[PDB]
Design an enzyme around this catalytic site. Structure first.
Site, mmCIF file in Angstrom:
data_model
loop_
_atom_site.group_PDB
_atom_site.id
_atom_site.type_symbol
_atom_site.label_atom_id
_atom_site.label_comp_id
_atom_site.label_asym_id
_atom_site.label_seq_id
_atom_site.Cartn_x
_atom_site.Cartn_y
_atom_site.Cartn_z
ATOM 1 C CE1 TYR A 26 0.961 -0.494 4.417
ATOM 2 C CE2 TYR A 26 0.687 1.856 4.153
ATOM 3 C CZ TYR A 26 1.172 0.793 4.880
ATOM 4 O OH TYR A 26 1.852 0.959 6.049
ATOM 5 C CG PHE A 36 0.823 9.414 5.370
ATOM 6 C CD1 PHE A 36 0.906 8.239 6.092
ATOM 7 C CD2 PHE A 36 -0.390 9.722 4.756
ATOM 8 C CE1 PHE A 36 -0.194 7.376 6.157
ATOM 9 C CE2 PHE A 36 -1.483 8.865 4.850
ATOM 10 C CZ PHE A 36 -1.370 7.685 5.543
ATOM 11 C CE1 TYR A 82 -4.848 5.757 12.703
ATOM 12 C CE2 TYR A 82 -4.525 6.607 10.508
ATOM 13 C CZ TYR A 82 -4.356 5.589 11.423
ATOM 14 O OH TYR A 82 -3.634 4.480 11.041
ATOM 15 C CG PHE A 99 -4.668 4.087 2.304
ATOM 16 C CD1 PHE A 99 -5.639 4.767 2.999
ATOM 17 C CD2 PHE A 99 -3.442 3.817 2.917
ATOM 18 C CE1 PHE A 99 -5.412 5.154 4.310
ATOM 19 C CE2 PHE A 99 -3.235 4.172 4.240
ATOM 20 C CZ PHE A 99 -4.218 4.875 4.914
HETATM 21 C C1 LIG Z 1 1.740 1.438 10.442
HETATM 22 C C2 LIG Z 1 0.872 0.697 9.560
HETATM 23 C C3 LIG Z 1 -0.652 0.919 9.514
HETATM 24 C C4 LIG Z 1 -1.148 1.642 10.742
HETATM 25 N N1 LIG Z 1 -2.634 1.471 10.917
HETATM 26 C C5 LIG Z 1 -2.952 0.938 12.280
HETATM 27 C C6 LIG Z 1 -2.541 1.863 13.326
HETATM 28 C C7 LIG Z 1 -2.030 1.382 14.521
HETATM 29 C C8 LIG Z 1 -1.643 2.250 15.533
HETATM 30 C C9 LIG Z 1 -1.659 3.607 15.249
HETATM 31 C C10 LIG Z 1 -2.130 4.032 14.022
HETATM 32 N N2 LIG Z 1 -2.534 3.170 13.120
HETATM 33 C C11 LIG Z 1 -3.618 1.741 10.028
HETATM 34 O O1 LIG Z 1 -4.783 1.494 10.318
HETATM 35 C C12 LIG Z 1 -3.344 2.309 8.678
HETATM 36 C C13 LIG Z 1 -3.823 1.385 7.610
HETATM 37 C C14 LIG Z 1 -2.953 0.200 7.504
HETATM 38 C C15 LIG Z 1 -1.570 0.606 7.139
HETATM 39 C C16 LIG Z 1 -1.010 1.521 8.160
HETATM 40 N N3 LIG Z 1 -1.952 2.675 8.417
HETATM 41 S S1 LIG Z 1 -1.525 4.140 7.802
HETATM 42 O O2 LIG Z 1 -2.682 4.995 7.845
HETATM 43 O O3 LIG Z 1 -0.839 3.993 6.547
HETATM 44 C C17 LIG Z 1 -0.316 4.754 8.929
HETATM 45 C C18 LIG Z 1 1.028 4.494 8.724
HETATM 46 C C19 LIG Z 1 1.913 4.951 9.641
HETATM 47 CL CL1 LIG Z 1 3.625 4.643 9.361
HETATM 48 C C20 LIG Z 1 1.462 5.655 10.747
HETATM 49 C C21 LIG Z 1 0.117 5.922 10.927
HETATM 50 CL CL2 LIG Z 1 -0.357 6.787 12.313
HETATM 51 C C22 LIG Z 1 -0.802 5.441 10.009
#
Ligand SMILES: C=C[C@H]1CN(Cc2ccccn2)C(=O)[C@@H]2CCC[C@H]1N2S(=O)(=O)c1cc(Cl)cc(Cl)c1
Length: 107
Positions: A26, A36, A82, A99
């Site tokens: 992704y 990001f 979020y 995404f």
């Molecule tokens: C780090 C990987 C995940 C993080 N999460 C779960 C999650 C867990 C804890 C805090 C924030 N989000 C998520 O739900 C989503 C969707 C899946 C892919 C990523 N994210 S993300 O939005 O790309 C993302 C990626 C990163 Cl490096 C940080 C944040 Cl705070 C959010």
């Protein structure tokens, strides 16, 4: 909510459900902003279990609409991501997320 727009097609048969381990690549972007985060930076695929609320609601609902092999664009409103808080330094307050998701396999 989450909007799902297909980029390239999957098998049209295998759609993940609660409790399954989904493996994806992704890229995450801010709507009206830039990337990001991405899986493909390190090339290690991202894995999560659907329906355990370990990812944002837009992923829960949007990836469930994807079949294995598919690449789709998910557009996710803040309340399905979020919210008012965000994650300062990576996701600002009240952010709509976009995404590009590729569903690789169930494991
Ligand atoms: C780090 C990987 C995940 C993080 N999460 C779960 C999650 C867990 C804890 C805090 C924030 N989000 C998520 O739900 C989503 C969707 C899946 C892919 C990523 N994210 S993300 O939005 O790309 C993302 C990626 C990163 Cl490096 C940080 C944040 Cl705070 C959010």
């Amino acid at each position: 909510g989450v909007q799902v727009e297909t980029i390239s097609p999957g098998d049209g048969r295998t759609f993940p459900k609660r409790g399954q381990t989904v493996v994806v690549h992704y890229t995450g972007m801010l709507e009206d902003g830039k990337k990001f985060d991405s899986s493909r930076d390190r090339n290690k695929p991202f894995k999560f279990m659907l329906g355990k609320q370990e990812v944002i609601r837009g992923w829960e609902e949007g990836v469930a609409q994807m079949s294995v092999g598919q690449r789709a664009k998910l557009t996710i409103s803040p309340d399905y991501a979020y919210g008012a808080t965000g994650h300062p330094g990576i996701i600002p307050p009240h952010a709509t997320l976009v995404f590009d998701v590729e569903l690789l396999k169930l494991e």
